[PDB]
PDB file of C-alpha atoms and ligand atoms in Angstrom:
ATOM      1  CA  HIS A   1       3.850  15.225 -68.963  1.00  0.00           C
ATOM      2  CA  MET A   2       5.669  16.858 -65.924  1.00  0.00           C
ATOM      3  CA  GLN A   3       3.462  14.478 -63.862  1.00  0.00           C
ATOM      4  CA  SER A   4       4.909  11.438 -65.706  1.00  0.00           C
ATOM      5  CA  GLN A   5       8.357  12.555 -64.692  1.00  0.00           C
ATOM      6  CA  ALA A   6       7.437  13.366 -61.091  1.00  0.00           C
ATOM      7  CA  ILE A   7       6.033   9.820 -60.720  1.00  0.00           C
ATOM      8  CA  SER A   8       9.318   8.273 -62.166  1.00  0.00           C
ATOM      9  CA  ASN A   9      11.371  10.402 -59.714  1.00  0.00           C
ATOM     10  CA  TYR A  10       9.116   9.230 -56.823  1.00  0.00           C
ATOM     11  CA  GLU A  11       9.498   5.511 -57.943  1.00  0.00           C
ATOM     12  CA  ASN A  12      13.334   5.863 -58.195  1.00  0.00           C
ATOM     13  CA  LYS A  13      13.520   7.332 -54.671  1.00  0.00           C
ATOM     14  CA  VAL A  14      11.205   4.648 -53.301  1.00  0.00           C
ATOM     15  CA  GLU A  15      13.265   1.879 -54.914  1.00  0.00           C
ATOM     16  CA  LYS A  16      16.413   3.247 -53.217  1.00  0.00           C
ATOM     17  CA  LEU A  17      14.822   3.213 -49.694  1.00  0.00           C
ATOM     18  CA  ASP A  18      15.451   0.160 -47.553  1.00  0.00           C
ATOM     19  CA  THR A  19      12.217  -1.619 -46.761  1.00  0.00           C
ATOM     20  CA  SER A  20      12.830  -0.843 -43.078  1.00  0.00           C
ATOM     21  CA  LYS A  21      12.879   2.955 -43.779  1.00  0.00           C
ATOM     22  CA  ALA A  22       9.854   2.741 -46.073  1.00  0.00           C
ATOM     23  CA  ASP A  23       8.025   0.876 -43.240  1.00  0.00           C
ATOM     24  CA  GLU A  24       9.185   3.498 -40.578  1.00  0.00           C
ATOM     25  CA  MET A  25       7.952   6.437 -42.766  1.00  0.00           C
ATOM     26  CA  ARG A  26       4.624   4.685 -43.456  1.00  0.00           C
ATOM     27  CA  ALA A  27       4.158   3.834 -39.732  1.00  0.00           C
ATOM     28  CA  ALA A  28       4.838   7.508 -38.820  1.00  0.00           C
ATOM     29  CA  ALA A  29       1.970   8.468 -41.207  1.00  0.00           C
ATOM     30  CA  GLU A  30      -0.326   5.883 -39.625  1.00  0.00           C
ATOM     31  CA  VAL A  31       0.501   7.059 -36.141  1.00  0.00           C
ATOM     32  CA  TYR A  32      -0.360  10.698 -37.213  1.00  0.00           C
ATOM     33  CA  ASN A  33      -3.617   9.366 -38.668  1.00  0.00           C
ATOM     34  CA  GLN A  34      -4.542   7.842 -35.361  1.00  0.00           C
ATOM     35  CA  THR A  35      -4.174  11.240 -33.573  1.00  0.00           C
ATOM     36  CA  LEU A  36      -6.852  12.882 -35.883  1.00  0.00           C
ATOM     37  CA  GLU A  37     -10.401  13.536 -34.587  1.00  0.00           C
ATOM     38  CA  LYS A  38     -12.993  10.992 -35.818  1.00  0.00           C
ATOM     39  CA  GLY A  39     -16.762  10.980 -36.021  1.00  0.00           C
ATOM     40  CA  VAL A  40     -17.041  14.751 -36.439  1.00  0.00           C
ATOM     41  CA  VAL A  41     -17.039  17.337 -39.237  1.00  0.00           C
ATOM     42  CA  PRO A  42     -13.415  17.584 -40.197  1.00  0.00           C
ATOM     43  CA  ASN A  43     -11.239  20.594 -39.093  1.00  0.00           C
ATOM     44  CA  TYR A  44      -9.183  21.490 -42.137  1.00  0.00           C
ATOM     45  CA  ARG A  45      -7.598  24.585 -40.374  1.00  0.00           C
ATOM     46  CA  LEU A  46      -4.065  23.713 -39.303  1.00  0.00           C
ATOM     47  CA  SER A  47      -1.847  25.736 -36.945  1.00  0.00           C
ATOM     48  CA  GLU A  48       1.695  26.382 -37.983  1.00  0.00           C
ATOM     49  CA  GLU A  49       2.989  23.613 -35.746  1.00  0.00           C
ATOM     50  CA  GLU A  50       0.523  21.145 -37.321  1.00  0.00           C
ATOM     51  CA  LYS A  51       1.577  22.249 -40.767  1.00  0.00           C
ATOM     52  CA  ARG A  52       5.230  21.555 -39.790  1.00  0.00           C
ATOM     53  CA  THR A  53       4.332  18.074 -38.654  1.00  0.00           C
ATOM     54  CA  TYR A  54       2.193  17.512 -41.905  1.00  0.00           C
ATOM     55  CA  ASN A  55       4.984  18.715 -44.199  1.00  0.00           C
ATOM     56  CA  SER A  56       7.585  16.433 -42.573  1.00  0.00           C
ATOM     57  CA  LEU A  57       5.515  13.284 -43.182  1.00  0.00           C
ATOM     58  CA  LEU A  58       5.699  11.260 -46.412  1.00  0.00           C
ATOM     59  CA  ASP A  59       8.184  13.619 -48.046  1.00  0.00           C
ATOM     60  CA  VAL A  60      10.018  10.957 -50.023  1.00  0.00           C
ATOM     61  CA  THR A  61      11.434  13.171 -52.845  1.00  0.00           C
ATOM     62  CA  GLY A  62      11.959  16.307 -50.742  1.00  0.00           C
ATOM     63  CA  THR A  63       9.511  18.011 -53.198  1.00  0.00           C
ATOM     64  CA  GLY A  64       6.448  17.044 -51.190  1.00  0.00           C
ATOM     65  CA  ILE A  65       5.185  14.111 -53.288  1.00  0.00           C
ATOM     66  CA  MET A  66       3.651  11.684 -50.796  1.00  0.00           C
ATOM     67  CA  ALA A  67       2.273   9.069 -53.269  1.00  0.00           C
ATOM     68  CA  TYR A  68       0.526   8.733 -56.712  1.00  0.00           C
ATOM     69  CA  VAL A  69      -2.936   7.682 -57.695  1.00  0.00           C
ATOM     70  CA  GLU A  70      -3.736   5.237 -60.570  1.00  0.00           C
ATOM     71  CA  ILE A  71      -7.261   5.099 -62.065  1.00  0.00           C
ATOM     72  CA  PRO A  72      -7.140   2.334 -64.725  1.00  0.00           C
ATOM     73  CA  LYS A  73     -10.570   3.062 -66.201  1.00  0.00           C
ATOM     74  CA  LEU A  74      -9.540   6.738 -66.910  1.00  0.00           C
ATOM     75  CA  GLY A  75      -5.903   5.905 -67.819  1.00  0.00           C
ATOM     76  CA  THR A  76      -4.882   8.192 -64.896  1.00  0.00           C
ATOM     77  CA  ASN A  77      -1.587   8.357 -63.142  1.00  0.00           C
ATOM     78  CA  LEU A  78      -0.968  11.449 -60.954  1.00  0.00           C
ATOM     79  CA  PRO A  79       1.441  12.450 -58.244  1.00  0.00           C
ATOM     80  CA  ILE A  80      -0.136  13.602 -54.970  1.00  0.00           C
ATOM     81  CA  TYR A  81       1.568  16.595 -53.195  1.00  0.00           C
ATOM     82  CA  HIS A  82       1.009  18.020 -49.725  1.00  0.00           C
ATOM     83  CA  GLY A  83      -1.955  20.436 -49.843  1.00  0.00           C
ATOM     84  CA  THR A  84       0.180  23.254 -48.318  1.00  0.00           C
ATOM     85  CA  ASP A  85       2.455  23.217 -51.443  1.00  0.00           C
ATOM     86  CA  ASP A  86       0.061  25.677 -53.057  1.00  0.00           C
ATOM     87  CA  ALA A  87       1.739  26.882 -56.254  1.00  0.00           C
ATOM     88  CA  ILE A  88       2.027  23.311 -57.490  1.00  0.00           C
ATOM     89  CA  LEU A  89      -1.768  22.808 -56.862  1.00  0.00           C
ATOM     90  CA  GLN A  90      -2.532  24.757 -59.993  1.00  0.00           C
ATOM     91  CA  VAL A  91      -0.964  21.771 -61.956  1.00  0.00           C
ATOM     92  CA  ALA A  92      -1.067  18.717 -59.709  1.00  0.00           C
ATOM     93  CA  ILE A  93      -3.292  16.851 -57.247  1.00  0.00           C
ATOM     94  CA  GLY A  94      -3.178  17.883 -53.552  1.00  0.00           C
ATOM     95  CA  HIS A  95      -3.955  15.887 -50.492  1.00  0.00           C
ATOM     96  CA  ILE A  96      -6.252  17.861 -48.209  1.00  0.00           C
ATOM     97  CA  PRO A  97      -4.348  18.755 -44.977  1.00  0.00           C
ATOM     98  CA  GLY A  98      -6.358  17.588 -41.905  1.00  0.00           C
ATOM     99  CA  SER A  99      -7.669  14.504 -43.722  1.00  0.00           C
ATOM    100  CA  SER A 100      -5.957  11.116 -43.207  1.00  0.00           C
ATOM    101  CA  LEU A 101      -2.629  10.621 -44.954  1.00  0.00           C
ATOM    102  CA  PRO A 102      -3.237   8.089 -47.736  1.00  0.00           C
ATOM    103  CA  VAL A 103      -1.684   4.999 -46.171  1.00  0.00           C
ATOM    104  CA  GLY A 104      -5.034   3.450 -45.298  1.00  0.00           C
ATOM    105  CA  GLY A 105      -6.016   1.495 -42.170  1.00  0.00           C
ATOM    106  CA  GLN A 106      -9.080   1.234 -40.068  1.00  0.00           C
ATOM    107  CA  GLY A 107     -10.238   4.697 -38.937  1.00  0.00           C
ATOM    108  CA  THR A 108      -9.019   6.605 -41.990  1.00  0.00           C
ATOM    109  CA  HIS A 109     -10.561   8.905 -44.579  1.00  0.00           C
ATOM    110  CA  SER A 110      -8.035  10.472 -46.942  1.00  0.00           C
ATOM    111  CA  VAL A 111      -9.145  13.297 -49.348  1.00  0.00           C
ATOM    112  CA  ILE A 112      -7.127  14.059 -52.468  1.00  0.00           C
ATOM    113  CA  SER A 113      -8.293  16.869 -54.804  1.00  0.00           C
ATOM    114  CA  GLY A 114      -7.928  18.526 -58.186  1.00  0.00           C
ATOM    115  CA  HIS A 115     -10.246  21.434 -57.221  1.00  0.00           C
ATOM    116  CA  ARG A 116      -7.364  24.065 -57.067  1.00  0.00           C
ATOM    117  CA  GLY A 117      -6.148  22.957 -60.505  1.00  0.00           C
ATOM    118  CA  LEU A 118      -6.124  25.250 -63.575  1.00  0.00           C
ATOM    119  CA  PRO A 119      -8.993  24.323 -66.068  1.00  0.00           C
ATOM    120  CA  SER A 120      -6.264  23.442 -68.661  1.00  0.00           C
ATOM    121  CA  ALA A 121      -4.535  20.916 -66.273  1.00  0.00           C
ATOM    122  CA  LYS A 122      -7.462  18.468 -66.493  1.00  0.00           C
ATOM    123  CA  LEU A 123      -7.089  17.155 -62.982  1.00  0.00           C
ATOM    124  CA  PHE A 124      -9.750  14.581 -62.155  1.00  0.00           C
ATOM    125  CA  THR A 125     -12.041  16.195 -64.782  1.00  0.00           C
ATOM    126  CA  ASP A 126     -13.007  12.562 -65.809  1.00  0.00           C
ATOM    127  CA  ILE A 127     -13.953  11.264 -62.329  1.00  0.00           C
ATOM    128  CA  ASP A 128     -17.651  11.780 -62.988  1.00  0.00           C
ATOM    129  CA  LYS A 129     -17.240   8.742 -65.356  1.00  0.00           C
ATOM    130  CA  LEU A 130     -16.519   6.444 -62.397  1.00  0.00           C
ATOM    131  CA  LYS A 131     -19.224   3.984 -61.308  1.00  0.00           C
ATOM    132  CA  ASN A 132     -19.791   1.963 -58.183  1.00  0.00           C
ATOM    133  CA  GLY A 133     -17.409  -0.959 -58.398  1.00  0.00           C
ATOM    134  CA  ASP A 134     -14.674   0.784 -60.324  1.00  0.00           C
ATOM    135  CA  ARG A 135     -11.208   0.724 -58.599  1.00  0.00           C
ATOM    136  CA  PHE A 136      -8.351   3.144 -57.966  1.00  0.00           C
ATOM    137  CA  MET A 137      -5.025   2.623 -56.244  1.00  0.00           C
ATOM    138  CA  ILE A 138      -2.753   4.730 -54.072  1.00  0.00           C
ATOM    139  CA  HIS A 139       0.878   3.738 -54.448  1.00  0.00           C
ATOM    140  CA  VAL A 140       2.668   4.893 -51.380  1.00  0.00           C
ATOM    141  CA  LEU A 141       6.355   3.989 -50.463  1.00  0.00           C
ATOM    142  CA  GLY A 142       6.241   0.718 -52.440  1.00  0.00           C
ATOM    143  CA  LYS A 143       2.886  -0.321 -50.969  1.00  0.00           C
ATOM    144  CA  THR A 144      -0.260  -0.476 -53.056  1.00  0.00           C
ATOM    145  CA  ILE A 145      -3.715   0.277 -51.500  1.00  0.00           C
ATOM    146  CA  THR A 146      -6.894  -0.328 -53.472  1.00  0.00           C
ATOM    147  CA  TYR A 147     -10.293   1.488 -53.207  1.00  0.00           C
ATOM    148  CA  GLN A 148     -13.564   0.583 -54.747  1.00  0.00           C
ATOM    149  CA  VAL A 149     -15.962   3.403 -55.675  1.00  0.00           C
ATOM    150  CA  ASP A 150     -19.136   3.249 -53.539  1.00  0.00           C
ATOM    151  CA  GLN A 151     -20.507   6.825 -53.560  1.00  0.00           C
ATOM    152  CA  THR A 152     -20.659   9.926 -55.842  1.00  0.00           C
ATOM    153  CA  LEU A 153     -21.826  13.199 -54.338  1.00  0.00           C
ATOM    154  CA  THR A 154     -22.331  16.547 -55.921  1.00  0.00           C
ATOM    155  CA  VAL A 155     -22.190  19.158 -53.120  1.00  0.00           C
ATOM    156  CA  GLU A 156     -22.019  22.866 -52.462  1.00  0.00           C
ATOM    157  CA  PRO A 157     -18.286  23.763 -51.698  1.00  0.00           C
ATOM    158  CA  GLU A 158     -19.013  24.249 -47.915  1.00  0.00           C
ATOM    159  CA  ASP A 159     -20.526  20.746 -47.348  1.00  0.00           C
ATOM    160  CA  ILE A 160     -17.643  18.593 -46.051  1.00  0.00           C
ATOM    161  CA  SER A 161     -19.821  16.556 -43.553  1.00  0.00           C
ATOM    162  CA  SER A 162     -19.257  13.394 -45.746  1.00  0.00           C
ATOM    163  CA  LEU A 163     -15.555  13.737 -45.311  1.00  0.00           C
ATOM    164  CA  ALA A 164     -15.711  12.742 -41.601  1.00  0.00           C
ATOM    165  CA  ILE A 165     -13.436   9.901 -40.469  1.00  0.00           C
ATOM    166  CA  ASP A 166     -15.387   6.735 -39.503  1.00  0.00           C
ATOM    167  CA  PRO A 167     -13.436   4.678 -36.871  1.00  0.00           C
ATOM    168  CA  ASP A 168     -14.605   1.408 -38.475  1.00  0.00           C
ATOM    169  CA  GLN A 169     -13.824   2.272 -42.174  1.00  0.00           C
ATOM    170  CA  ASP A 170     -11.000   2.960 -44.551  1.00  0.00           C
ATOM    171  CA  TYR A 171     -12.170   5.561 -47.189  1.00  0.00           C
ATOM    172  CA  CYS A 172     -10.487   7.640 -49.833  1.00  0.00           C
ATOM    173  CA  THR A 173     -12.435  10.484 -51.558  1.00  0.00           C
ATOM    174  CA  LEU A 174     -11.350  12.014 -54.886  1.00  0.00           C
ATOM    175  CA  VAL A 175     -12.553  15.624 -55.320  1.00  0.00           C
ATOM    176  CA  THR A 176     -12.837  17.932 -58.306  1.00  0.00           C
ATOM    177  CA  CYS A 177     -14.786  21.063 -59.254  1.00  0.00           C
ATOM    178  CA  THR A 178     -17.825  20.452 -61.397  1.00  0.00           C
ATOM    179  CA  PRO A 179     -19.105  23.628 -63.068  1.00  0.00           C
ATOM    180  CA  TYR A 180     -22.746  23.833 -64.110  1.00  0.00           C
ATOM    181  CA  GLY A 181     -25.148  26.707 -64.364  1.00  0.00           C
ATOM    182  CA  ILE A 182     -23.337  29.919 -63.444  1.00  0.00           C
ATOM    183  CA  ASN A 183     -21.845  28.459 -60.305  1.00  0.00           C
ATOM    184  CA  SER A 184     -19.176  26.013 -59.028  1.00  0.00           C
ATOM    185  CA  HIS A 185     -19.879  22.770 -57.103  1.00  0.00           C
ATOM    186  CA  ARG A 186     -17.673  19.887 -55.887  1.00  0.00           C
ATOM    187  CA  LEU A 187     -17.881  16.291 -56.918  1.00  0.00           C
ATOM    188  CA  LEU A 188     -16.783  13.832 -54.179  1.00  0.00           C
ATOM    189  CA  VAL A 189     -16.055  10.217 -55.428  1.00  0.00           C
ATOM    190  CA  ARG A 190     -15.565   7.951 -52.403  1.00  0.00           C
ATOM    191  CA  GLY A 191     -14.051   4.463 -52.427  1.00  0.00           C
ATOM    192  CA  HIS A 192     -13.747   1.882 -49.640  1.00  0.00           C
ATOM    193  CA  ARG A 193     -10.594  -0.224 -49.027  1.00  0.00           C
ATOM    194  CA  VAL A 194     -10.564  -3.661 -50.734  1.00  0.00           C
ATOM    195  CA  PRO A 195      -7.730  -6.234 -51.106  1.00  0.00           C
ATOM    196  CA  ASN A 196      -5.243  -5.757 -53.985  1.00  0.00           C
ATOM    197  CA  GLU A 197      -6.071  -7.817 -57.105  1.00  0.00           C
ATOM    198  CA  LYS A 198      -3.695 -10.497 -58.676  1.00  0.00           C
TER     199      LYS A 198
HETATM  200 NA1   NA B   1     -11.477  14.724 -38.629  1.00  0.00          NA
HETATM  201 NA1   NA B   2      -7.221   8.870 -39.509  1.00  0.00          NA
HETATM  202 ZN1   ZN B   3     -25.856  25.010 -55.772  1.00  0.00          ZN
END
């Protein structure tokens, strides 16, 4: 509802950027991605300096919306905020700081999550319905990037080893809470980069 309008605002801002500036902003995100450690358990603890850098990238709207995710099977369209934005994470999807920014490329693994969302917000609560072969799309600065689901893991909240950046791959993982028993777990739905469809 508010998400619908955040996405429209994002699109309007994008449509007003010159292609040159869109490309410059995207390239700056790719350059940052290249600086991240790879082949190791991710470090999701940023220093203040690193947070400053992170917050200044892909801030199209000035409200911290970097992109939006589309999941046709679920009818999903959701704005993706910086994961330091915090208040807004109770009602919107957050990119996990320290993971690759969602612009794709070899040697990237971006993580976007609804795990801090309020139960009533319904963020990614349907992703357990995704099967291997289903598609989702990140729309970032006028460019569309497509992922095909290839993995579905239910893990204890501490187990982030599968979120490591592989230098030969381009992955995006969608994350949500999955409550069962008297405890809380995490569902990680990974996709690998594939070409955009016609
Ligand atoms: Na890493
Ligand atoms: Na990266
Ligand atoms: Zn358990």
